[PDB]
Structure formats: structure tokens, C-alpha cells
Structure 1
Amino acid sequence: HHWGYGKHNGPEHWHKDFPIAKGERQSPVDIDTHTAKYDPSLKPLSVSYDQATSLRILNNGHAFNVEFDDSQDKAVLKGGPLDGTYRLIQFHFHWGSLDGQGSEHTVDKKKYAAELHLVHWNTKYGDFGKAVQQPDGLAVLGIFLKVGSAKPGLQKVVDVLDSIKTKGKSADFTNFDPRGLLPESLDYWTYPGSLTTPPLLECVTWIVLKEPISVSSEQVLKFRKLNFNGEGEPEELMVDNWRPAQPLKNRQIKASFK
């Protein structure tokens, strides 16, 4: 009876095995654009992905992860609200069964069709496992996806999904350049939060880009053909693998733009 996104093991049930689900800085949250405040102390955000080395892609029964070699500073995020260097370890998406839902963060309650999470860990902690024991151990760069024109840089990902249809399957996935998933502007909102899937650890500095990327209906439709179940099991389409917005509580969301 492991956590998932169904009626019986979904978001409303997570608190039983992971009490921190009702914690003080859970994610995602709704971003009230009018209440967010421009912060002049934010340094410019630096996304340096030119040396990124992707390794493989895996369906873990919740989403699919594109994993990177994080044994050296090859793809890093720095600046903005961060102190130090954060190394890219993997990226994944959360999407819906329909275009009107799918994102985890919302903007003035508006839901996008999907959301990309590029996960990074603070290099001062030595590794991912150690970073998730720290309040500033992780930085996740979130990018909204809306349905419109196709995103060329996402097609390589789309085309390999047929090979990892079910839970547990993985495939070689080298030379994928994450720069192809970035919108033009780096304007963003930032707030302290958590992982949005169990263990829901509160170690994340969230950086959510204001500008969404556009993906085609055909690209998102292929995400929805994936399976939550393992091979040879009854088919449960992988859709709506998003956690709804959580209480903001004692937090202020800062904007990098006026």
C-alpha cells in the first residue's frame, strides 16, 4: 500500500506515513502575484547547463525521471536566492489527465497543463542524501507548461517514453541538453518549501519561472500514455500525478522582477 495519486493512496493520505505533510513549509503553493514582493537583495539567477551529462530515463511508477551525472560541477544553478552552487541531479514533470490541470504550483489559482521540476542539491553537503537533511539542501527550478506550439527540445524525451511505458522500466538517455526546456525569461518567484512527493522533506528553495514554455497537445498526450502500474498489470494511465496547493502559513513569496 505505497503512496501514489489515487483515491486511496493519494495526497490526502500521505500524512499518515509522512507526518511532515502537514508541516510548516510544504509545497506546492498557490502564487498570489499581488501579494508576492519584489526583492532587490536577490542576485541574478545563473543557470549553467552547457556541460550537462544526462545518463538515463526511468519510469518510477509516479513520473519519469531523466537522471544526470552529478559527480562534478557540470550543470549548476547559482545566484538568485541561493548561496553557493547547486548541482543538477534529475528532472521530471507533473501533468494532468486534461489540459486544464496538471501543475503543482498555481498562479492566482490558475493551473497549467504541466510543470517541469529540475532538481538540484547544494554542493556544500557532498551528496543528495546529505543535502536532504538540510534546510537549504535543495533548489528546485519549476517551469510551467501550457499547450500551444510544440517545444522542439522536449521531443527527444517524448520519443523515448514508448520504451519506459511501465513502472520499473528505464533506458539509456545520454546527450540530452536541458537548455532546450527553458523559456526566454528567467523572471521568477521564490519561497522556502518542500519536496512535493513523499518523503515531503522541507529542504527546498523553490524558484518558479513566471514564463511558461509551450508544448504541443501531441507532446502532452504522449506523457498521458505512460503507466503507473508495472508491466503485465492492469493499466492505470499515468495522469494527474500532481499534489495540490498547500497552506502558505508563515511564508512570503518574493519576486525577482518589478
Structure 2
Amino acid sequence: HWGYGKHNGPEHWHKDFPIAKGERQSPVDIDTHTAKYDPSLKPLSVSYDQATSLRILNNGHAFNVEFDDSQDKAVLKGGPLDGTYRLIQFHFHWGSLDGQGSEHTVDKKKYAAELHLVHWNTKYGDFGKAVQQPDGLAVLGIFLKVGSAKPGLQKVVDVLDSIKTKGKSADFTNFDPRGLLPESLDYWTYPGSLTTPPLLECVTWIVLKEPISVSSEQVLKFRKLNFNGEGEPEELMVDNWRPAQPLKNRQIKASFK
């Protein structure tokens, strides 16, 4: 099945998921010179004070930190969005080296990693229904650069030993995702897709301009994870990013001057 090897990586996904060659695929390169400032965009409203993290899972593709999405406890609103979007999970994509790992790029620059906070539109009732709608999801994307440690990331890093292989989970309560945000909420936005199969074209992307800094040590621990299951040949979970896709007939809008 699909993955990030030579034989099963991004360049193969279209055979099982033909929407991979669609009109609104993600990620994309953000050309900062052609993204136009849209004064009609609102500030983003990130309301995570009541967020309830539950569990962390190695799904064989990344690790997901999962939230209780049975009520409006951690929600994204404003920005480009109409209505209310509930946080369901976050996860990262990262590289084998610090010079690649992000999905989105900025003027062709690749960051060491990218965080995706996934939210679904409450008007559709559940996640599964939301992903069938063009405005079903809002994903907040945050770039990671290697420098100073991110204190708020360390709780995630330190549990990764317990979910080394595919299918492992661990309790992961009381984690505050506010500690993963940069100072500024300036953003770019465009319509796109999930970046993993099934690649559904259901996402309003909100990509923050300001990266967070993580330490080398932190990212090294991501790279100790495994794609494989327990007692299978070890294959390090690295380079779990889809490259930039054609922009096609889209515009990327900037919230800032």
C-alpha cells in the first residue's frame, strides 16, 4: 500500500487515487511575490484553551496527537473561514536531514518539518462527512526550522519511544497545542487537498508565515520513529512529505502586507 518509499511513494499514488492529478492538490509552493494581500481576510481565531488531547498514535505514516472532537472545545474560526472548525488531530511531516521535510515550500525553500493541525467543519456533523465537502476541513500549517528548542514540543518528543512502530498508541492527555504556535498568526491561504491518500479536495489551507524553532535534538527524535510494525525490518520514519503540486487555477492570498 501507499507510503513514502521508491516503490510506493508520492509519484505512485495516482494509480490508486487518481485525484492525485486533480485541480486542487496540496501541498504547493508559496510564491511570496505573487501571493496578493487580501484586506478582506480576517484575523485568525485559534481557541484552544479548552482543548482535550487524548492519545498519540503511530499510524505508519506519521504520528497523530488526537483530541476529543465530540464538542466545540478547540476550534478554529475567522481567517478565510465561514463557520466553526473543530480540532481533531495534529501531526508532522519531516525529513531525513534538516534541508527538507516540509510539504509546503516558500519561494522553493523547504523547512525541516511542517506541523498540520487538522480541523473539520461542524456544519457537516462528523469528520467522515466533512472530507466529502469542498469546505469540509481547515488545516493550519506551521513550518519548523532547526535552532532553539521548542519547549512546548518536548512532551511530544519524549513519548515517541513508546510508539516507535506502526499501530502503537499511548495515552496523551493534558497536552496544550498552544505551545506549538509561533508569535504571529499572519498567514497565506488557498484551497487544496489532503496531502496523503485519499487526497480529497476538501481543505482550506491556512499556512502561517512565521516558523517555529525546534532543536536538532527534537527533530532527531522524530527520525527514530519507524514506518514498519513491531519486529519488522526497521525502516526509519523520515521523508514522510509529499512534494509541491501544480497550483493550476488557484490563487494564494496573504493576510498581511
**TM-score under structure 1 length normalisation:** 0.99
Quick one: distance in 2 between partners of 1:192 and 1:39?
15
Report how far residue 43 of structure 1 moved.
Answer: 1.5
SS for the counterpart of 1:160 is: helix
Report how far residue 86 of structure 1 moved.
Answer: 0.3
Gaps of 5+ in 1: none
Report how far residue 40 of structure 1 moved.
Answer: 1.1
SS for the counterpart of 1:112 is: coil
Maintained 8 Å contact 2:4/2:10: yes
In structure 2, what is the equivalent of residue 139 of structure 1? 138
- Partner deviation per Cα, 1:35-86 (whole Å, 9 max, x = no partner): 0000111121100000000000000000000000000000000001000000
Identity %: 100
Quick one: distance in 1 between partners of 2:41 and 2:124?
23
Report how far residue 24 of structure 1 moved.
Answer: 0.3
Report how far residue 15 of structure 1 moved.
Answer: 0.1
- Partner deviation per Cα, 1:213-232 (whole Å, 9 max, x = no partner): 00000000000000000000
Report how far residue 166 of structure 1 moved.
Answer: 0.2
Maintained 8 Å contact 2:38/2:253: yes
Quick one: distance in 1 between partners of 2:232 and 2:186?
43
- Partner deviation per Cα, 1:121-155 (whole Å, 9 max, x = no partner): 00000000010110000000000000000000000
Gaps of 5+ in 2: none
Quick one: distance in 1 between partners of 2:105 and 2:118?
19
Quick one: distance in 2 between partners of 1:239 and 1:133?
30
SS for the counterpart of 1:12 is: helix
SS for the counterpart of 2:148 is: coil
Deviation beyond 6 Å, 4+ runs, structure 1: none
- Partner deviation per Cα, 1:8-32 (whole Å, 9 max, x = no partner): 0000000000000000000000000
CA RMSD of the aligned region, Å? 0.3
SS for the counterpart of 1:13 is: helix
Maintained 8 Å contact 2:43/2:185: no
